[PDB]
Amino acid sequence: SSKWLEGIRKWYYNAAGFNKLGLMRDDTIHENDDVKEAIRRLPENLYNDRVFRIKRALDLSMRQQILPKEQWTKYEEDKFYLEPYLKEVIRERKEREEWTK
């Protein structure tokens, strides 16, 4: 049932690897310009925390070294912050397209 799909999700989140460099979900997003608008529109404190986590990740991958066991961001306590903002940017994209057609 629904419990099994969530267990697949938890396995995949552990085997993905971006919890071993301390990152969170909304820090691996590939940039179009919509992503760039969503990154522009952030509140300041989470933007600073984003750049700190990114900079630790680039450091650790520079010396190709994984964080300890204890500092891994465990599943479903990471902040899913970008999906409102990126959702609204894509919504305005669809709005431009449906208005000009």
């Binding site: 522009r40 529109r41 305005e92 709005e95 431009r96 208005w99």
Partner: protein, 414 residues
């Protein structure tokens, strides 16, 4: 034409004045007491920021939907404000007012005001203040109000230099929550019917500071640009009084803007007597700033720097010889007819007619037709004019000045 106005003051606090005439250019004004006097020293620039914030995302419809739809039906939205008021004016065809009315509803009662658009709005504030103060007279007038109120009426129509950026939109949203309440809205309409606005204003708004004293003093600006501006005003008369109407007839007797282009202010006796006094190219007028709980009145002078105080002395002696009863009475009647022409020709269009009919409606509580107001222009005795001028002489002073101020006195030699 068997048609005329229609009124209803909806008793939970709002006004509706519809005028179903047969003109295609239909206009909707929505008038609120939310001007600069409801904003204090800790949130300056906020009404200016709200004026340029006409076109943002509202609760349900983003700014794209709003701007593109209103331009697609082709309506034009202008927003105008004074120290007392704001005024949302949407002008369009006679048939396309319901969706523009819903966009007006969104603009009023649907605030989101998101932060990146607020930053773009900061840039817009800087550009707007430059376009404002690149003309000298408005700078002088804001100095003048700053030199005659020890409270919230002295503030600008704009953003001061230190409120750029330091203003956040949640200050605006709390400003919405404490002043855009439903008991403060006068909805006036030209070209629309009463039941349309009755349904909209009845179902579609649904929400629900202190007096200003007299400061007294002067504000100088050394500018060094060969056009000395000087405005001198005393506190005269609040709203409503035929005393203030007598000050209006007084400024007609003194002289207002020239009714003839390329003239020399013929019956405007200030410039006649001061051209007799000073033989130079200069420019003199009178001015009156009536507001609800207080008022102001005085004169204004553009002059060369070398002959400024001579003009100020001469016109001041003209005010003294008029306040000491040395004039003619049918000239007061012809100036009453000048105010008749002024009031009837401030309501030529749809637009200024809308403006002052609604501002009078929001001020006086009910509508008053213009013909009895013309009767009230003619029906004020000359003793009221003389006592008003003597009250202006008897009062204190308020002087704003700008330019090469090395030939202009301060107080005593005024």
């Amino acid at each position: 034409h068997p048609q005329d106005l229609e009124f209803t003051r909806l008793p939970n606090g709002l006004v509706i004045a519809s005028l179903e005439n047969y003109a295609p250019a239909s206009r909707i004004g929505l008038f609120i007491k939310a001007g600069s006097r409801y904003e204090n020293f800790n949130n300056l620039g906020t009404s200016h920021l709200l004026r340029l914030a006409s076109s943002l995302t509202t609760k349900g419809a983003s700014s794209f939907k709003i701007t593109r739809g209103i331009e697609a039906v082709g309506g034009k939205l202008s927003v105008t404000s004074t120290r007392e008021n704001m005024a949302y004016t949407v002008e369009c065809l006679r048939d396309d007012v319901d969706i523009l009315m819903e966009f007006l509803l969104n603009v009023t009662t649907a605030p989101e005001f998101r932060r990146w658009e607020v930053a773009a709005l900061q840039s817009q504030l800087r550009i707007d203040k430059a376009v404002a103060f690149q003309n000298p007279q408005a700078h002088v007038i804001e100095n003048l109000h700053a030199a005659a109120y020890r409270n919230a009426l002295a503030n600008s129509l704009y953003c001061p230099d230190y409120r750029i950026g330091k203003v956040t939109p949640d200050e605006l949203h709390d400003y919405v929550q404490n002043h855009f309440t439903s008991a403060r809205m006068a909805l006036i309409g030209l070209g629309v019917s009463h039941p349309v606005l009755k349904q909209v204003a009845e179902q579609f708004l649904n929400i629900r500071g202190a007096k200003a004293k007299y400061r007294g003093g002067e504000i100088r600006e050394q500018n060094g640009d060969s056009l000395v501006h000087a405005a001198l005003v005393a506190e005269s008369a609040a709203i409503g009084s035929a005393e203030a109407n007598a000050f209006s007839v007084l400024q007609h007797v003194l002289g207002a803007g020239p009714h003839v282009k390329r003239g020399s202010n013929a019956t405007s006796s200030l410039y006649q007597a001061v051209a007799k006094g000073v033989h130079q190219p200069f420019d003199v007028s009178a001015f009156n700033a009536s507001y609800s709980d207080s008022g102001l009145f005085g004169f204004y002078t553009i002059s060369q720097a070398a002959s400024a105080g001579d003009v100020i002395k001469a016109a001041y002696n003209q005010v003294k010889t008029i306040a000491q009863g040395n004039l003619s009475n049918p000239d007061v009647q012809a100036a009453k007819n000048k105010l008749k022409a002024g009031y009837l020709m401030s309501v030529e269009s749809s637009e200024g007619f809308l403006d002052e009919v609604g501002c009078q409606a929001l001020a006086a509580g009910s509508y008053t037709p213009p013909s009895t107001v013309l009767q009230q222009i003619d029906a004020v005795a000359d003793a009221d004019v003389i006592n008003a001028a003597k009250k202006f002489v008897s009062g204190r002073k308020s002087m704003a000045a700008s330019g090469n101020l090395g030939h202009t006195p301060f107080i005593d030699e005024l």
